[PDB]
């Protein structure tokens, strides 16, 4: 039997939110001048001149 | 000089590094690099700003902004490939040459070869 009162449930959710997909779209990234780019040892990658 | 001035003004509304500027006869092209990935709005804004900045100096320009290819008088690049127009006319000439019919037959064959290499057989 379908009992109307017994079948009532208060479904809860968040009122509203916005979902995002590409997080890195929010990141603007630049490089230092390649002449001054350094390696793991803190020295410039290329030093020939 | 003109493109340097225009790019200087365009830097007002956008941050970019001018990678290269090339002035090839009947065309000019400059590559601008941004700190973000290029969007539709960025392309449209750069095109409009370039046009308006050129107009500020009374220069009428159709500033075409792309991310993948250009079209200039002596070539055009599409999809990472290069194309040359094969529009050399064979049975018509721009002006009367100072050569003989023999040399003009030689030039006709030369033009046919160049057109064939460029895709017009």
Tab-separated table of C-alpha atoms in Angstrom:
chain	number	residue	atom	x	y	z
A	1	UNK	CA	0.000	0.000	0.000
A	2	UNK	CA	1.112	3.548	-0.773
A	3	UNK	CA	0.990	5.567	2.451
A	4	UNK	CA	1.414	9.237	1.601
A	5	UNK	CA	2.749	10.281	5.013
A	6	UNK	CA	5.226	7.397	5.235
A	7	UNK	CA	6.548	8.209	1.744
A	8	UNK	CA	7.414	11.856	2.485
A	9	UNK	CA	11.144	12.501	2.843
A	10	UNK	CA	12.888	15.857	3.207
A	11	UNK	CA	15.712	15.672	0.679
A	12	UNK	CA	18.582	17.965	1.667
A	13	UNK	CA	21.121	19.529	-0.672
A	14	UNK	CA	23.246	22.634	-1.000
A	15	UNK	CA	21.258	25.691	-2.018
A	16	UNK	CA	23.686	26.656	-4.780
A	17	UNK	CA	27.277	26.359	-5.925
A	18	UNK	CA	29.322	26.724	-9.099
A	19	UNK	CA	31.414	23.845	-10.451
A	20	UNK	CA	34.669	24.463	-12.320
A	21	UNK	CA	36.598	22.172	-14.663
A	22	UNK	CA	39.955	23.673	-15.743
A	23	UNK	CA	41.660	24.995	-12.618
A	24	UNK	CA	44.803	26.039	-14.497
A	25	UNK	CA	42.657	28.365	-16.614
A	26	UNK	CA	42.737	30.599	-13.515
A	27	UNK	CA	46.565	30.586	-13.424
A	28	UNK	CA	48.599	33.018	-15.518
A	29	UNK	CA	52.206	31.872	-15.753
A	30	UNK	CA	55.322	33.486	-17.202
A	31	UNK	CA	58.984	32.561	-17.587
A	32	UNK	CA	62.036	34.518	-16.472
A	33	UNK	CA	64.473	35.591	-19.174
A	34	UNK	CA	66.026	32.362	-20.534
A	35	UNK	CA	69.512	33.848	-20.151
A	36	UNK	CA	68.926	33.817	-16.378
A	37	UNK	CA	67.080	30.497	-16.095
A	38	UNK	CA	68.801	28.334	-13.483
A	39	UNK	CA	69.134	24.593	-12.950
A	40	UNK	CA	68.778	22.489	-9.800
A	41	UNK	CA	72.267	23.554	-8.666
A	42	UNK	CA	71.215	27.253	-8.657
A	43	UNK	CA	73.474	28.059	-11.639
A	44	UNK	CA	72.327	29.119	-15.085
A	45	UNK	CA	71.401	26.251	-17.392
A	46	UNK	CA	73.657	27.652	-20.137
A	47	UNK	CA	76.748	29.748	-19.376
A	48	UNK	CA	78.633	29.746	-22.696
A	49	UNK	CA	79.855	33.098	-24.041
B	1	UNK	CA	58.662	51.979	-36.732
B	2	UNK	CA	54.891	52.146	-37.219
B	3	UNK	CA	54.274	48.636	-35.904
B	4	UNK	CA	56.539	49.302	-32.914
B	5	UNK	CA	54.496	52.410	-32.095
B	6	UNK	CA	51.207	50.538	-32.504
B	7	UNK	CA	52.368	47.636	-30.326
B	8	UNK	CA	53.535	50.120	-27.697
B	9	UNK	CA	50.001	51.513	-27.569
B	10	UNK	CA	48.425	48.034	-27.590
B	11	UNK	CA	50.466	47.112	-24.507
B	12	UNK	CA	48.251	49.545	-22.557
B	13	UNK	CA	45.369	47.062	-22.317
B	14	UNK	CA	47.251	43.745	-22.458
B	15	UNK	CA	50.474	42.267	-21.116
B	16	UNK	CA	52.468	40.438	-23.771
B	17	UNK	CA	55.985	39.903	-25.054
B	18	UNK	CA	56.547	40.697	-28.722
B	19	UNK	CA	58.449	37.635	-29.909
B	20	UNK	CA	59.140	38.697	-33.502
B	21	UNK	CA	58.198	41.491	-35.892
B	22	UNK	CA	58.632	40.944	-39.634
B	23	UNK	CA	58.112	43.535	-42.373
B	24	UNK	CA	57.975	41.522	-45.612
B	25	UNK	CA	57.212	43.935	-48.430
B	26	UNK	CA	53.450	44.128	-48.853
B	27	UNK	CA	52.744	42.496	-45.474
B	28	UNK	CA	53.717	42.844	-41.835
B	29	UNK	CA	53.321	40.291	-39.083
B	30	UNK	CA	54.185	40.246	-35.389
B	31	UNK	CA	53.885	37.392	-32.894
B	32	UNK	CA	52.660	38.383	-29.423
B	33	UNK	CA	53.041	36.028	-26.454
B	34	UNK	CA	50.784	36.219	-23.394
B	35	UNK	CA	50.993	34.895	-19.835
B	36	UNK	CA	47.696	33.017	-20.356
B	37	UNK	CA	46.329	30.812	-23.105
B	38	UNK	CA	44.782	32.864	-25.900
B	39	UNK	CA	40.985	33.182	-25.832
B	40	UNK	CA	38.464	34.382	-28.400
B	41	UNK	CA	37.979	37.655	-26.541
B	42	UNK	CA	41.731	38.248	-26.398
B	43	UNK	CA	42.045	37.781	-30.166
B	44	UNK	CA	39.106	40.073	-30.899
B	45	UNK	CA	40.347	42.734	-28.474
B	46	UNK	CA	43.868	42.671	-29.910
B	47	UNK	CA	42.513	42.972	-33.453
B	48	UNK	CA	40.234	45.881	-32.537
B	49	UNK	CA	42.965	47.646	-30.558
B	50	UNK	CA	45.459	47.299	-33.409
B	51	UNK	CA	42.931	48.670	-35.894
B	52	UNK	CA	41.998	51.610	-33.660
B	53	UNK	CA	45.627	52.427	-32.846
B	54	UNK	CA	46.532	52.414	-36.537
B	55	UNK	CA	43.520	54.650	-37.189
B	56	UNK	CA	44.826	57.045	-34.530
B	57	UNK	CA	47.633	57.784	-37.016
B	58	UNK	CA	45.148	57.947	-39.934
B	59	UNK	CA	46.304	54.544	-41.231
B	60	UNK	CA	43.540	52.287	-42.561
B	61	UNK	CA	44.468	48.717	-41.617
B	62	UNK	CA	42.611	45.416	-41.684
B	63	UNK	CA	44.399	43.822	-38.730
B	64	UNK	CA	44.009	40.043	-38.978
B	65	UNK	CA	44.795	38.164	-35.759
B	66	UNK	CA	45.159	34.380	-35.747
B	67	UNK	CA	46.818	31.718	-33.618
B	68	UNK	CA	47.656	29.139	-36.296
B	69	UNK	CA	48.377	30.754	-39.673
B	70	UNK	CA	48.819	33.920	-41.695
B	71	UNK	CA	48.152	34.980	-45.281
B	72	UNK	CA	50.628	37.366	-46.915
B	73	UNK	CA	51.281	38.295	-50.537
B	74	UNK	CA	54.072	35.801	-51.241
B	75	UNK	CA	52.872	32.809	-49.176
B	76	UNK	CA	50.325	31.661	-46.637
B	77	UNK	CA	50.556	29.150	-43.790
B	78	UNK	CA	47.624	26.945	-42.784
B	79	UNK	CA	47.657	24.025	-40.368
B	80	UNK	CA	51.424	24.155	-40.010
B	81	UNK	CA	51.802	23.814	-43.788
B	82	UNK	CA	53.017	26.397	-46.309
B	83	UNK	CA	51.313	27.266	-49.598
B	84	UNK	CA	52.362	29.495	-52.492
B	85	UNK	CA	49.782	30.899	-54.884
B	86	UNK	CA	50.017	29.319	-58.342
B	87	UNK	CA	48.563	32.322	-60.136
B	88	UNK	CA	51.186	32.859	-62.836
B	89	UNK	CA	49.206	33.511	-66.006
B	90	UNK	CA	50.433	31.668	-69.094
B	91	UNK	CA	48.496	33.058	-72.075
B	92	UNK	CA	48.302	36.603	-70.652
B	93	UNK	CA	51.117	38.941	-69.615
B	94	UNK	CA	51.226	42.044	-67.441
B	95	UNK	CA	53.063	44.081	-70.082
B	96	UNK	CA	54.833	43.632	-73.396
B	97	UNK	CA	58.242	42.104	-72.791
B	98	UNK	CA	61.480	42.953	-74.574
B	99	UNK	CA	62.166	39.323	-75.538
B	100	UNK	CA	61.601	37.078	-78.553
B	101	UNK	CA	58.862	34.528	-79.142
B	102	UNK	CA	61.493	31.828	-78.551
B	103	UNK	CA	62.408	33.249	-75.151
B	104	UNK	CA	58.715	33.763	-74.423
B	105	UNK	CA	58.083	30.072	-75.104
B	106	UNK	CA	60.911	29.301	-72.682
B	107	UNK	CA	59.328	31.629	-70.113
B	108	UNK	CA	55.948	29.995	-70.745
B	109	UNK	CA	57.373	26.569	-69.931
B	110	UNK	CA	59.151	27.991	-66.878
B	111	UNK	CA	55.905	29.524	-65.612
B	112	UNK	CA	54.084	26.250	-66.255
B	113	UNK	CA	56.699	24.396	-64.194
B	114	UNK	CA	56.433	26.894	-61.338
B	115	UNK	CA	52.631	26.680	-61.388
B	116	UNK	CA	52.760	22.877	-61.381
B	117	UNK	CA	55.091	22.859	-58.383
B	118	UNK	CA	52.651	25.176	-56.577
B	119	UNK	CA	49.623	22.974	-57.292
B	120	UNK	CA	48.172	24.440	-60.516
B	121	UNK	CA	48.704	21.814	-63.212
